[PDB]
Design a protein around this ligand. Sequence first.
Ligand SMILES: Nc1ncnc2c1ncn2[C@@H]1O[C@H](COP(=O)(O)OP(=O)(O)O)[C@@H](O)[C@H]1O
Ligand SMILES: [Mg+2]
Length: 337
Amino acid sequence: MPKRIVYNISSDFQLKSLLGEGAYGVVCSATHKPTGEIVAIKKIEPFDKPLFALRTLREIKILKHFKHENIITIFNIQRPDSFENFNEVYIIQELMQTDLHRVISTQMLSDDHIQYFIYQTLRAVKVLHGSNVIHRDLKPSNLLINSNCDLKVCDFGLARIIDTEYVATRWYRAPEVMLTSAKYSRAMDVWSCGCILAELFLRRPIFPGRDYRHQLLLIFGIIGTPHSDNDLRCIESPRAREYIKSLPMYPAAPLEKMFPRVNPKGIDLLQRMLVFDPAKRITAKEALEHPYLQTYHDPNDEPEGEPIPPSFFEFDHYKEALTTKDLKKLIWNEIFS
Ligand SMILES: Nc1ncnc2c1ncn2[C@@H]1O[C@H](COP(=O)(O)OP(=O)(O)O)[C@@H](O)[C@H]1O
Ligand SMILES: [Mg+2]
């Protein structure tokens, strides 16, 4: 483990390996000496900028509010010693074996495993959506996987309650999001799920855009360029509609020929997810009922979720901006709840 990685945690924990390292979070596996149980600990420094603190607060509230087989299980959160020296949050969770990005990049998955993985992802999206929560950052690296192929979603800080900012990786973001100030919608998560399913089939990301322009170019190269007014109707900005009209007119690609080895039923489901008009995209519930997933579908074992009021994230609607001191107290009081 790199010496540059410093955790200020209980002596009952012995850090083992670095699992993830970014500008927002750092994740390591650790041995809980007292029990010999190995866990994952996510370290976050949330108070340099408001966006980091907001992301931290949403992540911990969602983690502590949800209980679902396809949502990572949180075990504990370190209790800070003093409000003054409180500058790091440590989230203790169940240790998973790997993540779907690593699996896709290292394994030749069978159609059955692809079905099971997308099924579990959609089952988690169903409960979030039924609770009026959109994830906004679904992608393979945020899907945790165990040896028995159980999949659990993580990284809930970019979530919003449906009623500078961190944004999802461009490769998995819905087109309408990069074309205007689109209203939050469940359809954006479904788009990400479509990108994840396409990636499972292709074994590499399907829309690896180098930038905003390129991303839209790759997307339309596959789903087809919306041409008529009716198609361009979902786009609010007239400037955005004009820009789309300046792109080449691509027809929808023949996926049956683009994926001759893939299960036809899987391609059908994929085409129902990667639709330009967000309103025409299949819902998570409908996707679970799709023939491609009949082996796993169980209408009596797919939690619908319970509505969460927007006030759960009341801070997202503040007029007079929140100070970092305001956010520090909010996170502190959430830890002790
Ligand atoms: N509970 C966990 N068990 C095993 N690995 C994990 C766990 N949580 C995160 N990871 C690893 O750490 C990476 C980053 O974690 P993530 O929670 O997505 O934070 P970030 O906000 O930095 O993306 C994941 O992509 C995964 O490889
Ligand atoms: Mg992540």
